[PDB]
Design a protein around this ligand. Structure first.
Ligand SMILES: Cc1ccc(Cn2cc(C(N)=O)ccc2=O)c(C)c1
Ligand SMILES: Cc1ccc(Cn2cc(C(N)=O)ccc2=O)c(C)c1
Ligand SMILES: NC(=O)n1nc(-c2ccco2)nc1N
Ligand SMILES: NC(=O)n1nc(-c2ccco2)nc1N
Lengths: 317, 317
């Protein structure tokens, strides 16, 4: 035991906890100045005792060197996109289809309802609680390695906030740029004779395809987790909403507008409520993602790859 | 001009025409013995004058040498699979969804209704009327090069039957093994202490993954074309059914049970009629493939890749 090792450990724990309160709970227990005091105390002590510097320390989010190019990552589990609907009647047709298709239709049929964030879909792998890799969705089978860029995102923990993390956990979510950060970015870019972005989605896409993580760090990106891919060494909750509450409880940011709704009519009320809040959210949304909450029912229903909306195979019983 | 070149040309034309009548029209104008007389007259003349032997001659379906392994082919246009339905109510939900989603719903809504063949999906490319390449569907993006095996299939023309073939035409269909051929294959395999096949789909899959085309040739495989991929240098018909009538008119085999139906009720009558004929067809089917007939409506409706059946994005207008 040394006093330096203990001070480093204590500072790291305290800082990760403050990052959780600020970023995930939106309820910081200390002012930003106090967080920064401890942050640059940690940074200086590590630099004076580099034998104790860890790769997942709060001070190590930015790789000091730009990359040459992005490597490709093949997802172990396919990463899905979403089919869409443009009206209440079309949404009702989607529900009616599920109701007939299910072996046993529960009473009620519960949906996890989420805002549809207009950003870039990503996969972030935690091995024994440590962030080891991150990839873009790509085509759903293969994506690009954006690990270094994802590490710069302030609300993405470099380590899970739990003493018993799973052996492996893949978090899936959307990276997006809120309105305030987007407005600042364009003001700065116009002042410094640099290129402006047309909308926050383009700004987030561009920021994540940047090869220098020093540049990504200056871009105000945020993650909101919406699902789980790989999960080894953990009994994941059996409902989608509980899985999200679980990710939040171990350090992962989740959108606070998510709600449970029973049946199509309550779901359409959620859709209208979010449609009315659009103006007040502070980030861009495209619509709502409506998900069957029960995981066993998701597994039964399954997914479809490269299928026309203009044809169907009516199978014989 | 030489008399040998003229005799070879005449024999090839006559044989390709008889192959069309026998395989595509199911209405041969001559007996099998007459077709064979001309066939082995062509084969002998080519072998006595090998300078005039062509790669697309009716006698050149079987590459005399097995391959080492299958090469991979990336489809230029994605090759689609089908979503499915298990009841009238589920099928009606699929139609109701289309009716609401379309900008303008026509009166009537016409469907091209086909039996769902239980075989292997393939892509066959014709360049200036010549069969140059064939691939399995694979994952819809990449498949295996099965050109040599596809050339052995008796009802697959090595050249299109038209004096003005498109610059490029990609035929998509199902390769399957009819009941009679399947029964013969298993009888022969059991007699010759060889492995039997559980069902015709397995027999067709196995036959197409064979590396020696000499073995594929002895397997009674059939193509039925169900669509078109690439098409350059041709104004394709604007309805799916007319595109199939067009493929038939230029030498490609198409299933004769295909019909046009107006609205969901007529479509369900087609489904019940085919379900009753199952016993009498002479090949295995899984159900029916029901397609929006209008090509512009197919283009408007589009397709979905890797999407859950348990979620939807209701987009804001
Ligand atoms: C100078 C400075 C330091 C920190 C922050 C924001 N913030 C605050 C906390 C906190 N209060 O626990 C934790 C992490 C964090 O990123 C800003 C915007 C500016
Ligand atoms: C000996 C032999 C020759 C031909 C056939 C079948 N067949 C017939 C014709 C035909 N009638 O125009 C054309 C092609 C073809 O494959 C069988 C089964 C047996
Ligand atoms: N974009 C967005 O906000 N998404 N996307 C999904 C998604 C994609 C596939 C499954 O779920 N869920 C949410 N909230
Ligand atoms: N298997 C079968 O008989 N199919 N498959 C299609 C298909 C697959 C994608 C588009 O169409 N059409 C028919 N008749």
């Amino acid at each position: 035991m040394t006093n330096i090792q203990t001070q480093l450990d204590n500072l790291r724990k305290t800082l990760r906890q403050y990052e959780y309160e600020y970023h995930v709970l939106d309820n910081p227990s200390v002012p930003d100045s106090e967080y920064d005091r401890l942050f640059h105390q940690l940074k200086a002590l590590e630099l004076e005792h580099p034998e104790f510097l860890t790769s997942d320390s709060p001070t190590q989010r930015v790789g000091a060197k730009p990359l040459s190019g992005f490597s490709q990552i093949r997802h172990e589990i396919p990463m899905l996109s979403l089919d869409n609907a443009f009206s209440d009647a079309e949404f009702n047709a989607f529900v009616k289809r599920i109701e007939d298709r299910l072996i046993l239709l529960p009473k009620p049929l519960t949906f996890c309802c989420e805002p549809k964030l207009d950003g870039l879909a990503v996969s972030i792998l935690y091995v024994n609680g440590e962030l080891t890799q991150a990839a873009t969705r790509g085509d759903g089978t293969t994506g690009e390695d954006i690990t270094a860029n994802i590490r710069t995102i302030r609300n993405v923990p470099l380590q899970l906030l739990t003493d018993n993390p799973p052996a492996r956990l893949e978090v899936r979510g959307e990276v997006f740029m809120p309105h305030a950060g987007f407005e600042r970015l364009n003001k700065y870019a116009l002042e410094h004779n640099e290129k402006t972005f047309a909308n926050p989605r383009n700004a987030a896409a561009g920021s994540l395809r940047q090869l220098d993580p020093n540049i990504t760090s200056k871009r105000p990106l945020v993650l909101n987790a919406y699902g789980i891919g790989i999960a080894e060494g953990v009994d994941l909750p059996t409902t989608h909403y509980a899985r999200l509450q679980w990710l939040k409880s171990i350090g992962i940011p989740v959108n606070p507008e998510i709600r449970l709704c029973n049946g199509a009519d309550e779901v359409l009320g959620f859709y209208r409520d979010i449609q009315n809040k659009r103006s007040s959210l502070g980030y861009d949304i495209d619509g709502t993602v409506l998900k069957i909450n029960d995981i066993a029912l998701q597994n039964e229903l399954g997914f479809i790859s490269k299928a026309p909306r203009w044809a169907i195979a009516y199978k014989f019983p």
